[PDB]
């Protein structure tokens, strides 16, 4: 029952293994022998369930007995049991039981991955939860046409019926999976499941009280607003002529409220940010971007009489950008939790389908435009935010914001392996905030062969006041600090990426088995905290030396 000091130390090495590290048959036989001892440690549960052969009924039964007696696992470890690796229904009920203890704030951060976990859930239990050919059921028409106890589908709907923000995101995350043409063709049973999830969610909203019934009518109003906006986008993209002829069509159709109903609507929540209620799109200030993809810049009239600028794209998959931005939002929240605000810009991204979606426009000037107009980053900051007492004639608040945003994004783009990095993707604000846009290349993927691991640039270093400035010393300091805090939440970041292997993300579908390993290698879990600091310092030293030696 109780192992000796040598075996106790040997079991600790097995528990300390990174998520990718697979246990050998003799290694998992040792874990199985002392399964009753390991119940006192919550971190051992992940390693014990790796030993079990789920095709063997008694081995699965014995694991379930130990599962109930084991120390209550963390929310980050519960996400691993909802992945492709664990298809046993009882295991998934215990994973759902731990999410029930977690707050709605935490549940929102993993919601995109929780919708993806439905793929591994029991499809019959989902269908038999309702009180024809799958093509006959249009997902967009479900909400607009009204007539260890809980599983993942029952839990997500139950929590959504209580929280309006959670209901908003759960709706649009399921709608995208329904509209997924790849899932519709390669596995119709998965497509049918997502339709039943939507049909069950619509049914539970109608069954609910006055405030619950109001939620589905607002969701129907959001879908109708989106469907009309898509029809507007199609007509503008199909319009023969230049950008000016297309802009005139966009402004005229938006203004015609009797035909399109987009300029004047009742106070409805914005699908991108449900906390922000909208009056409609301003027709006179809506124009298309210079891009061939034809994205539209739309200004939304808020409840408070403000302006919410958005980038509504049509004919492009926002799914890859949606994941990266939700990970940046998680990483920012994790860094803020450890009392380190690196002034990051995790702009809201919401796909309304696999073909169309919204993007939160942040008032910023790209570094390419900054160089073409002002010459350098420092000249731009000295023009819009000057101070004589501050460093290099630039405001102390703005410079501090710049150093933190440069250090913050340097670590994040390194871990996420963000490729195709040029001055048009690097965006700068008048407040100091530096951020990355257009995440078309991630997890080592890059159009150029042999890309650098750290995406540092000569202009970023020049903006800090050189390599000898006290701002660059702060950059190095905030770089290893950000790396140390993110390494502490490595299990959380990797388990969410593990739940995204079957998601139709172009850069994940390329190498699904290697996805988790790609992120894990960047964290350098083989090295200690003190070693990780010097490795981060070595990455900066190498990148800086390679940059000037162009």
Binding site for ligand EUT (CB under 6 A): 289, 291, 293, 295, 311, 347, 359-362, 364, 366, 424, 427, 437-438
On whether the CB atoms of residues 518 and 19 are closer than 8 A, the answer is no
Cβ-based nearer residue to ligand EUT, 275 or 291: 291
Distance CA 247, CA 252 (A): 9
Cβ-based nearer residue to ligand EUT, 15 or 362: 362
Cβ-based nearer residue to ligand EUT, 360 or 490: 360
In the complex, residue closest to ligand EUT by CB? 289
In whole angstroms, the minimum distance from the beta carbon of 532 to ligand EUT comes to 31
Cβ-based nearer residue to ligand EUT, 293 or 510: 293
In whole angstroms, the minimum distance from the beta carbon of 352 to ligand EUT comes to 15
In whole angstroms, the minimum distance from the beta carbon of 444 to ligand EUT comes to 20
Burial 357-381 (b: 16+ CB within 10 A, else e): bbbbbeebebbeebeeebeebbbbb
In whole angstroms, the minimum distance from the beta carbon of 280 to ligand EUT comes to 21
Cβ-based nearer residue to ligand EUT, 19 or 295: 295
Cβ-based nearer residue to ligand EUT, 353 or 520: 353
Distance CA 181, CA 185 (A): 6
Strand partners, 351: 357
Cβ-based nearer residue to ligand EUT, 200 or 436: 436
Cβ-based nearer residue to ligand EUT, 30 or 437: 437
Tokens 């519960």 found at: 78
In whole angstroms, the minimum distance from the beta carbon of 340 to ligand EUT comes to 23
Cβ-based nearer residue to ligand EUT, 233 or 359: 359
In whole angstroms, the minimum distance from the beta carbon of 320 to ligand EUT comes to 10
Distance CA 238, CA 253 (A): 14
Distance CA 73, CA 71 (A): 6
On whether the CB atoms of residues 318 and 349 are closer than 8 A, the answer is yes
In whole angstroms, the minimum distance from the beta carbon of 314 to ligand EUT comes to 12
Structure tokens at 292: 């061939």
In whole angstroms, the minimum distance from the beta carbon of 426 to ligand EUT comes to 9
Q: What string of DSSP letters covers 66-115?
A: HHHHS----HHHHTTTTSTT---HHHHHHHHHHHTTS-HHHHHHHHHHHH
Tokens 């309006």 found at: 164
In whole angstroms, the minimum distance from the beta carbon of 373 to ligand EUT comes to 13
Tokens 């078309």 found at: 440
Phi-psi region of 400 (alpha: psi -120 to 50; beta: other; left: phi over 0): alpha
Structure tokens at 81: 């049991």
Angle at 321 (CA atoms; ends 315, 326), nearest 5 degrees: 140
């Amino acid at each position: 029952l109780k192992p000796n000091a040598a075996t106790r130390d040997q079991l600790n090495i097995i528990v300390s293994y990174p998520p990718t590290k697979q246990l050998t048959y003799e290694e998992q036989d040792l874990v199985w022998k002392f399964r009753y001892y390991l119940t006192n440690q919550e971190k051992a549960l992940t390693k014990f369930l790796k030993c079990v052969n789920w095709d063997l009924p008694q081995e699965a039964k014995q694991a379930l007995e130990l599962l109930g007696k084991w120390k209550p696992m963390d929310v980050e470890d519960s996400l691993e049991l909802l992945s492709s690796h664990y298809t046993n229904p009882t295991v998934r009920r215990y994973a759902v039981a731990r999410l029930r203890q977690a707050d709605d704030e935490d549940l929102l951060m993993y919601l995109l991955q929780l919708v993806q976990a439905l793929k591994y859930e029991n499809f019959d239990d989902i269908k038999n939860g309702l009180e024809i050919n799958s093509a006959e059921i249009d997902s967009s028409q479900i909400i607009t046409s009204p007539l260890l106890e809980q599983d993942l589908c029952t839990f997500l709907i139950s929590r959504a019926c209580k929280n309006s923000t959670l209901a908003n995101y759960l709706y649009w995350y399921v709608i995208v999976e329904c509209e997924d043409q790849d899932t519709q063709q390669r596995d119709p049973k998965t497509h049918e499941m997502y339709l039943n999830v939507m049909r069950r969610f619509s049914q539970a909203l109608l069954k609910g009280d006055k405030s619950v019934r109001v939620m589905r009518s607002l969701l129907a109003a959001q879908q109708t607003f989106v469907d009309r906006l898509v029809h507007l986008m199609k007509a503008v993209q199909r319009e023969s002529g230049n950008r000016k002829k297309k802009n005139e069509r966009l402004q005229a159709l938006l203004g015609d409220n009797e035909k399109m109903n987009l300029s004047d609507v009742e106070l409805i929540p914005l699908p991108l940010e449900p906390q922000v209620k909208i009056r409609g799109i301003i027709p006179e200030t809506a124009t298309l971007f210079k891009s061939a993809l034809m994205p539209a810049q739309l200004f939304f009239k808020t409840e408070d009489g403000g302006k919410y600028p958005v980038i509504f794209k049509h004919g492009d998959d926002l799914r890859q950008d949606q994941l990266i931005l939700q990970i940046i939002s998680l990483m920012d929240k994790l860094l803020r939790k450890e009392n380190l605000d690196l002034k990051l810009t995790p702009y809201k991204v919401l796909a309304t389908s696999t073909k169309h979606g919204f993007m939160q426009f942040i008032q910023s000037v790209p570094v390419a435009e900054v160089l073409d107009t002002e010459g350098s980053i420092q000249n731009f900051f000295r023009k819009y935010a000057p101070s004589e007492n501050g460093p290099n004639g630039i405001s102390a608040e703005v410079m501090d914001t710049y150093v933190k945003s440069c250090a913050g994004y340097c670590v994040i783009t390194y871990i996420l392996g963000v490729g195709d990095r040029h001055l048009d993707n690097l965006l700068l604000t008048k407040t100091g905030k530096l951020f990355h846009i257009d995440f078309g290349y991630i997890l080592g993927r890059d159009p150029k062969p042999l890309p650098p691991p750290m995406k540092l640039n000569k202009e970023m270093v020049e903006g800090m006041g050189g390599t000898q400035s006290e701002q660059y010393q702060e950059f190095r300091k905030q770089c290893y600090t950000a790396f140390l805090h993110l390494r502490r939440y490595s299990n959380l970041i990797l388990n969410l990426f593990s739940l995204m292997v079957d998601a139709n993300i172009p850069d994940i579908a390329l190498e699904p088995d290697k996805t988790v390993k790609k992120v894990q290698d960047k964290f350098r879990l083989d090295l200690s905290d003190e070693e990780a600091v010097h490795y981060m310092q070595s990455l900066i030293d190498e990148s800086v030396h390679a940059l000037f030696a162009a």
